[PDB]
Structures are given as C-alpha cells and as structure tokens.
Design a protein around this ligand. Structure first.
Ligand SMILES: Nc1ncnc2c1ncn2[C@@H]1O[C@H](COP(=O)(O)OP(=O)(O)O)[C@@H](O)[C@H]1O
Ligand SMILES: Nc1ncnc2c1ncn2[C@@H]1O[C@H](COP(=O)(O)OP(=O)(O)O)[C@@H](O)[C@H]1O
Ligand SMILES: Nc1ncnc2c1ncn2[C@@H]1O[C@H](COP(=O)(O)OP(=O)(O)O)[C@@H](O)[C@H]1O
Ligand SMILES: Nc1ncnc2c1ncn2[C@@H]1O[C@H](COP(=O)(O)OP(=O)(O)O)[C@@H](O)[C@H]1O
Ligand SMILES: N[C@@H](CCCC(=O)O)C(=O)O
Ligand SMILES: [Mg+2]
Ligand SMILES: [Mg+2]
Ligand SMILES: [Mg+2]
Ligand SMILES: [Mg+2]
Ligand SMILES: [Mg+2]
Lengths: 272, 30, 273, 11, 273, 273, 33, 9
C-alpha cells in the first residue's frame, strides 16, 4: 500500500494523517511544488489536504486523470464545497434552512420577499466564516450587493441567501467518513458566526439525533469524508453545509475520536 | 519537516529558518 | 412547447435563437433579473445564453433542480468551460497541443523543462483572449507568476500552460451540435491571439479534416452544442479548446450555416426527452 | 451604458 | 495660445471644452495614449479631463514637471478628490456633516458611539456614488467592514464615515470656477444616493444661500474649478464633498450656464501664468 | 513631553524605538485600533510606523490635522513613497536610472523605443519588492500590461518603467535622518531583485561616494527619515528609490549604527518644530 | 460623424483608419468626477 | 501575521 498526501503546510491534521498512513504502508508526502501533470506517480491512493479549496479540487481531478483514486474525489470536492450545489443535493434528503439564489443584483433584491429579514448572505465557495453577512433590512442588502459587485471574482455574482436561524449561542459540527459517524462537537461563540477559525470553542456533542441526521446528510452525497455543519432551530435540526477538506484538530482533541485514522482507513479501502 | 507550522511556517531545511504563513486567500479552509 | 431563453444582453445570436424557438412553440425570454430559485417555472427546456460562464453554469444547475432540462447542461458547461477539465477529457481522444499543469509557482517554474520556451500561460476559466501570455524566458515566467499570485482570485492559482504553437496567421473555429458538424471558419489575425472579439476576421473553412476532428472532439463530451477551437501546426490539426456558450454571428454569416436553428432544434429534441 | 466586462464573460 | 486637453473618451463635456478652447487658440487633444514622460510638450496650459481620478492626478503632476500649468492642479486634484483630505480642508470653514475616520476594523467599530445610527460609509477616493453604504446597525457595519477587508485596494482600509443626513429627496450640486459661482442644480432621486451617474435627475437650483456657501467651500481650497455637493438638512445646508474633475452636461443643459466656457476662460487666465 | 508611536505589529524596529523614545519622555503606543479622528490626543510628536504605507500616510495627515507633527510627515510619506513622484523630485538633483511613465498600455508599448530591452516594470506604490518584472521583449511587456490592467487597483494603471541596470550582484541601502547620513549597507543576492524581505544578505558599506550621494538624495526632499536605494552601474552610482517607512534591523545589526535612536532624536527635534 | 474615442448600447470609436467600434471599458473604482 | 497587503513596507 502506497499512500500519497497532498498538502500546502503540514498542519496538525496532516502530521496525524501521515502517521496513520504509515501504519498501513508507504507514505509519500506531496507538497504542491511536487505536483506537475501529466506526470508519473506510483501511488495507490491520494489523500487530498491542500488548504486552498480550488487547489484541492484540481489536484484531485489531475490524480484521477492518472488513474489514481483520490479522497476526497474531485466530484465530491466540487459538489460539497459549493454551498449552492451542496444545498441542492441536501434539500431532497434532509432539513435545510430556507434559502434563495439569484443570478443578478435585481433578482437578489427580491429575496427578502421570500425569506424575510434578517437573512444571511454568504459566498458560494467560502470557508472559515469569511464574507458572511447578517442582513437586517434593505439598506444592508444593498450595501452587501454593492460590495460583492465591485469585487473581482465572478463567483460573487451568484447570490446565495438563507433565512437567519436563531441558534442557541452555538452550532454543531459533525464528521462522517465512508458512511460511518465518527464524532461531533458544539462550536460556541458570543457572535452568531461560530467557526473555530474565528475563535469558536469546541465541546463534545453526543446527541444521537445529530449522529442520525449527519449520516443521512452524508448519504445525500454517498461518498467520502465530510465535515457537516448543523444548526439547532425552533423547527429542529437543520443541515447548513458540508465540507470536503475537513479540519478536525480541535474536534479530535475534544471528542477523543480518531478522525485521521478513520480517514486513512477509508482511503485504503478506496485504494483497493 | 519542510512545511510544519509551529507555535510560523518552516520554509527551509538546509539552513533551518522559520517564516510567517502566507496571505489567507478567499478559497482557504475546509 | 415552452422554451426558455436565458440571457444577459440580447445579442444577434439571442434574437436569432428567439426567432427559431418561435417556430417550435412559445418562447420565454428570461433576463437574469427574472431568475430566482427555488421558483415555479413552466418550461420544457431552457437554452442557456448568459454572457458570464459562471452565471450560465449555476443557472443550468438551478433549472435542472426544477426538473427542467437545459442546453447546455451544467455538467457540460463545467467540464467544457474549464480549460484543464476539458483538455483532460480531450487527451484520450483527439490530438491537443502539449500542455502542463502545476499547483504552485515552484511547480510552475519546472514547466519549461517539459514544454521548453516559448510557452503559453492562460487562465483556466477565460474567454475572448483574456490574460493570455506568450512567455519566452524565465524572466517573463516569473513576472506572469508574480502577477497571477497577487490577483487573489484563487482560480488563478491553477497554472495551466501549453507549448506555443506556430500557427499560419490564423486559427480554426468549428461548430458541432448534437454530434452534427454545422460549419467552420478561419479567424485571421496579424497577432498570435486570433479571437474575433479581439479583431480577428473570419472566412469559411471547408477543410474536410477539421469536420472529422471536430466531431471527434465533440464525442469526447458526448452531448450538447460546442464551439471548437483548432490550431493548424507543424504536426497537423490540434484541438485547443471547446466552448459551451458559443458565439456564432460572424460564423453563421460567413458560412451561411444556420447555427441558431440547429441549436434550437437540438433543444426541442432534449425537451422531448 | 454597457456594464463592466468581467473575468468570465464570453463563450 | 496652445491649449492641451487630456481625456479618456470624448464625453459631451470634453467636446464642449474642445470647442470653447478653439476660440482662444490651437487645441491639442491628448488621449492617454499620447501621454509619455519625460517628453517635450509645447503647451501653455493643459485642461485635465481624464475619467480615472488617479490618471488625472498623475498626468497633472507630470505636466507640472514639464513646467506646464494644469487645470486642475495635481495638488487640488489630490486634496479635493480624496474625501478625507477634503473634509480636513473644509472643516471649520463651512458646515459639514459630522464625520469620523478610523484606520482599522477595530477602530471603525467604535465609530457608531460618536456618530450614532444610521451612518454612511464611503470610500475615500470614490465617485458616482459607488460603494456608498447606509449602515443602520452593528450587523450592517460588520458586513461592510468584512467586505472592505477582503477587497484588494489598501485605500479601502481607510474607513471614512459620516452621520446619515435626512435630505428632502434630493441634494444640491453647485459649480465654482476661479472663485466665481457659475451655477447649481438639484439632483432628485427616490433613493438616498442622488448622483446623476446612478440615475438621479437634474433640475435648476436658484437658492441664494447655496451660492454663498459654495464660494466659501471653494475658498477652503483657493484655486481651480470645483463641483461642490451640498445637503439640505434640518440644521441648514451642509457641504458634503468637492470634485476636481467636474461633470456638468445635465447641469449646463438644465441651468443654461456655460460651464465648459467658464472652465476654459479660467484655463486661459492660468495660461498667462 | 509625550511621544506617540503608531504601529501595526511590534517588529524589532518598533520595540527599539519605544525604548529610545522613553529616554526623552512619556511613550504612548498607538495600535491602529486606537486611531480615531477627530479625537482628543495629547502628544508632542508621533512616530509613524504603520506597515501599510497608505495607513501611514493617512495616519500622518490626521495627526497633523490635530496639530501634532509626525515623523515622517504626510507630505514626505506621499512624495517619497510614490516611485514616480519621488523620481520627479530626484530628477536633476541626483543621477537616476533612465525612466519613463505612461498613462495607458498603448502609451506603455512605446516605452521600449526610449529605454530598450531589458527594462523593469514596477508598481508606483509597492515595496519588498512585490510585482517587479524584468521585461526582455514585447511579449513580456504585453503580458505584464494585460495583467496590470485586469488587477483592480487603479494605481496599477500608472505605468512606470526604468532601464534595466546591470548591478554587480548587489545594491546599496543607505540611511539619512534629518540631513545626517547614519549608515549604509550592501544587499547581496543571486537574483537581480535584492531586498532583505526577499532574502538579500546584508554587509556594511563605507563607500564615501554613497554617503555623499545619499545626503544629496535626502536634500531633494529636504526633510525626514529616509532609506535610500542606490545602484552601482557601468555609468556610476544611481539613486533608484527612497523609502519613508524605513526598516533597519539588519542595517543596524550589520553597521552597528543606532538607527532607532537617530529617528527618535529627529522626532524630538520635530516636536520642538 | 465621429472622432477617435467618441461615445457614439454604449460604444467607443477605438479606430478610424479601420473603423472599429467597441464596448466602453469596465467602470473602475476611481472613475468619475 | 495577517495576509500581507499590496501596500506593506
Ligand atoms: N443562515 C444562518 N443562520 C445563522 N447562523 C449562520 C447562518 N449561516 C451561517 N451561520 C453561522 O456562520 C458560520 C459559518 O457559516 P457557513 O459559511 O455556512 O460555514 P463556512 O463559512 O464555515 O463554510 C456557521 O457555522 C454559523 O455559526
Ligand atoms: N498554445 C497556443 N499556441 C498558439 N496560439 C494560441 C495558444 N493558445 C491560444 N492561442 C491563441 O489565442 C486564442 C485564444 O486562446 P484560447 O486558448 O482559445 O483562450 P480563449 O478561451 O480566451 O479563446 C486562440 O484562438 C489562438 O489564436
Ligand atoms: N452622509 C450622507 N447622508 C445622506 N446622503 C448622503 C451622505 N453621503 C452621501 N450621500 C448621498 O450619496 C451621494 C453620493 O455621495 P458622495 O459623498 O457625493 O460620494 P461621490 O463622490 O461618490 O458622489 C450624494 O450626492 C448624496 O445624495
Ligand atoms: N531598474 C532596475 N534595474 C536593476 N535592478 C532593479 C531595478 N529596479 C529595481 N531593481 C532591484 O529590485 C529591488 C527592488 O526594487 P525597488 O525599486 O527598490 O522597489 P521596492 O520599493 O519594492 O524595494 C532593488 O533593490 C533592486 O535590487
Ligand atoms: N525594507 C528593506 C530593509 C533593508 C534593510 C534591513 O534589512 O535592515 C528590505 O525589505 O529590503
Ligand atoms: Mg465551509
Ligand atoms: Mg461552516
Ligand atoms: Mg478560443
Ligand atoms: Mg464625488
Ligand atoms: Mg458626490
């Protein structure tokens, strides 16, 4: 068994993944500087850990083109990593916050007619809670749209919104690998944006309903290793997003669950 | 190892020198 | 039959498509402001003509979510509209210029060892000739990489390169809809970038070999309506790229081919499942 | 007053 | 008398200026392509009409470096064109809306304690009402600051705010050239942002208070041709802003004042040293 | 006496400045979060140490607006920190590399006719030194211009060029605080770009000609604390740029000069006017 | 009827010797008065 | 450190 790991920097995540991969067989640590295609790679599977989402997406697709399977797959990285594509996949199968998508500023201005205020505006490709906005009225909506308009990225012209959900000072982050629930935490914060990346604090979550809902949410995609974000609302549990390049250092610390081991064990299952 | 982040980023081995992590981009994360 | 046409501005091609769509049934012109999802849309097929490639991709996907088939499909728009995903799909099936992809500038610095100079750096999601660079040496490579890095649109972090192909003052633009070759033109330019959006002049192309190569290139994807870009070279015809939101006004005029009619016909056939 | 030409405009 | 005019495109303003300058001497139309420094230019004065505020500033400075006086000057273009610098010059000379400036996100978060809500965020170098934001609460402030932060331009890190002034469905745009009041208009909109560039509509303004206030505002800079923005409020007229590359086509049309002619007459006077 | 220091992060230089300033009076450390205007500040002088050059410039102007002098002043930060404004100020006072400025890419394409290849393209406001490009031919020129154009910052649309100077594997960095030369170093590198932020190795420079040339370069501006960049060339020493936000921790270590102390001493003098 | 760089659905005369019309450039963040 | 801006020096 020969296992590649692609990375940008060696985070705690990647060191743990390397150790666990080394228990199964030979490990090949592939910095982005070592990624050049077409090329000759002798690998049974590649575990994709690039920090940039888009770099993760393309490096998965490139290894696939060399006949090397990838965890996660390029398909999953794109489908789960885009908030709009991901909620469209989720909406069949699990409860999600009410949402709206518009293709222009003029259409976006009609979103409050469906969702009401307050609502949340967020980019389709973001992570770590960046560019999230709680919009309480029309003036705020107009300000967000004006700023999105003047940014370079044409992806900011896909306007994705959700109802603002009143959470009890926290949200939930769940881990499902290969269809198996591996663990969950609460992320607490004094701010409505609860990411550990922005100072959210982890507590272990043993709620059996989040386990059940998380597996179902994973099943909407049917492959891979996903971090799942769930909100507690007055209507019950809602699946918000799914993340295909999971961070877990805090979750693992807080829960005692071996996210790195489960990831690797799933990758070698996928290899053979 | 040649890119460990430590409490920032190890840029070099032969002469071991630390350096600040790069600019956070708009697609960085999970 | 209710046929949606999704657009940004009504160009000559959109008006033609509207007219042909009218022959087959009721036409619904959807400006981007009319696009709000989830929503109630009473349509049998939508012809996707948004000027922005990303807006086209997401509107295709969104109409599919409502059980409405779309020409082109979101999968095709995604795979054909991205230069790297597209060459990967073409690589088995048709000749293509030599290419290299790298994920960082360090990797990108090793590309000339495979391709040699001069080489062509281009973004993965571009059109109309945007941000193409002809890179003749190490100094320009560094310059191009430095600039790509400070642009901070993360798509510019995928470094895609081709060998510089010596073209005979022109390239070829071909059209295949639903597997049928509908026509092709030469685009002439005294600069190596030949787009008609950059001043390239078109005349008809009746080279039997490009018809054959175009259909093969289409077959690598297996669906939809594609504009195909071919280079004449020292080693014969090469497929450069494929375009899932074809412009065709000069192509249709020059060749006399009814691109808009063929596109609409293909859409009514997908409407009939 | 045609709007701004963007990075992904075209074909 | 050789009078230069630097431009980007020939808007109505630039055409009118060209015509009036022709009655005083030889006009030399300088597109941005014609601008190369150091160079030998044989002009007695240059009228700066570049659409880019920053290109105007630099071409003014560059001509000044060739010993050729410029209208407006590089100094006025910079001071008047930057909201913050301009506010510092206007302050204590004329009434202005309450304002605050911060240098980081954390400092900007305390601005509401001084100004209250609603407040107005705007970029320091902007025009045409772009990126203006009416901020009604802390969530909106955080939203605007988050987006500002991710924008590339380090100028977006200078956080300039004003109190929101409740205007009567319009504001006032006046013109003072060389110290002489030459005219004023109302700009009406159903939206709080009234710029004609965003669809606001000109009407003649003959209020004698604006004439006096306008001259006082110009006197804070003491030179050049300025378009001045004034707000009516429950506490009387406030000077908002000053603009050193005036547009006036709607203003001239509506008041019948010859703004182009006055600008040119002032330029021939500075031409005489 | 109360001496203010504005900072983004506490580098080695800032800590050295804080200790030195304490020998003269009360030191107040002002993080960007503490900067809010208009405000009540009680300081005799502010030492401007913001990592952002634009934050530094605006911070300086705002303290000046409150009657508090700054080192450096807003004027000097603007003129010295802009490569083009700086070059204009140096021209005719000290030898400089042949340079050229254009206001459009069309104009920029003519720059080689004066300067020849290779040439250097650099942004007007950068440091460290980001976005420097060595342009060996027209293809590289075109690539650089196309990239510059698609970037958002309008300052990237001021096209500043120098002849490529063939240095002997190094360049010079000297320091002049008030009219007083405080020290100079050599920056060595294998690559043509030799910044210490980029990896350049420092060694002491005692060439009396550069001490002389350094004071002359400072005298072109006539105030402040400046870091001056000098090249050695086939035609003698050339003054490349000037930096109003001086880093010096390697320069001080290598030369043993007290750059921090001199800067503080100059500030206290500025406080006394 | 038009001079080079005239604003003739917004178009710019980008050449005369071969008459070329083009869409006006994208509005930049420092465009205006 | 934060992301180095195009302004830093
Ligand atoms: N619609 C919403 N209602 C309430 N809180 C939200 C909503 N959307 C996002 N959040 C908060 O912001 C955080 C980041 O949101 P999200 O962008 O969906 O995940 P990420 O940006 O981490 O990919 C969430 O974990 C949650 O705390
Ligand atoms: N590798 C290459 N060698 C030679 N010419 C090229 C190459 N790549 C692109 N071109 C020229 O540039 C034009 C546009 O490039 P292309 O790859 O088609 O990008 P776009 O999608 O912007 O049209 C082509 O039609 C061709 O004239
Ligand atoms: N503080 C404010 N209160 C109310 N309206 C304002 C305020 N600031 C700006 N506006 C409105 O927005 C318009 C544009 O703002 P302005 O400060 O003139 O920036 P610009 O340089 O973009 O014109 C003004 O003409 C006015 O109608
Ligand atoms: N025209 C040139 N010829 C040769 N080397 C140059 C030229 N311009 C800059 N350099 C090199 O690049 C370095 C950085 O450029 P500089 O103009 O000093 O900008 P910055 O303010 O970014 O340091 C210089 O120290 C020098 O070594
Ligand atoms: N800011 C300069 C510092 C040079 C002098 C020094 O290293 O002390 C640079 O980045 O090269
Ligand atoms: Mg996420
Ligand atoms: Mg999340
Ligand atoms: Mg093409
Ligand atoms: Mg203005
Ligand atoms: Mg205004």
């Amino acid at each position: 068994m020969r296992i590649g790991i692609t990375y940008t920097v060696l985070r705690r995540e990647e060191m743990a993944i390397k150790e666990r991969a080394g228990e199964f067989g030979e490990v090949v640590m592939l910095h982005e500087d070592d990624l050049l295609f077409p090329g000759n790679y002798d690998l049974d599977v590649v575990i994709i850990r690039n920090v940039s989402h888009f770099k993760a997406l393309y490096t998965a697709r490139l290894f696939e083109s060399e006949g090397i399977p990838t965890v996660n797959s390029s398909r999953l990285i794109f489908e789960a990593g885009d908030k709009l594509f991901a909620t469209l996949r989720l909406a069949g199968k699990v409860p999600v916050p009410e949402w709206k998508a518009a293709l222009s500023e003029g259409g976006a201005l009609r979103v409050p007619d469906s969702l009401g205020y307050p609502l949340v505006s967020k980019p389709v490709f973001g992570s770590w809670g960046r560019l999230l906005a709680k919009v309480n009225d029309r003036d705020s909506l107009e300000a967000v749209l004006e700023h999105r308009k003047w940014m370079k990225n044409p992806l900011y012209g896909i306007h994705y919104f959700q109802e603002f959900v009143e959470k009890p000072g926290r949200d939930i982050r769940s881990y499902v690998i290969g269809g198996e629930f591996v663990g969950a935490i609460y992320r607490y914060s004094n701010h409505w944006i609860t990411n550990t990346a922005r100072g959210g604090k982890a507590e272990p979550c043993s709620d059996p309903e989040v386990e059940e809902l998380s597996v179902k949410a994973w099943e909407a995609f049917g492959e891979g290793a996903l971090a799942i974000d769930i909100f507690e609302s007055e209507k019950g549990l809602l699946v918000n997003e799914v993340n295909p390049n999971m961070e877990f250092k805090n979750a693992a610390r807080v829960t005692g669950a071996d996210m790195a081991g489960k990831l690797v064990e799933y990758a070698v299952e996928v290899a053979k | 190892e040649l890119h460990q982040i430590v409490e920032l980023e190890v840029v070099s081995l032969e002469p071991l020198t630390l350096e600040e992590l790069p600019e956070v981009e708009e697609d960085w994360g999970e």
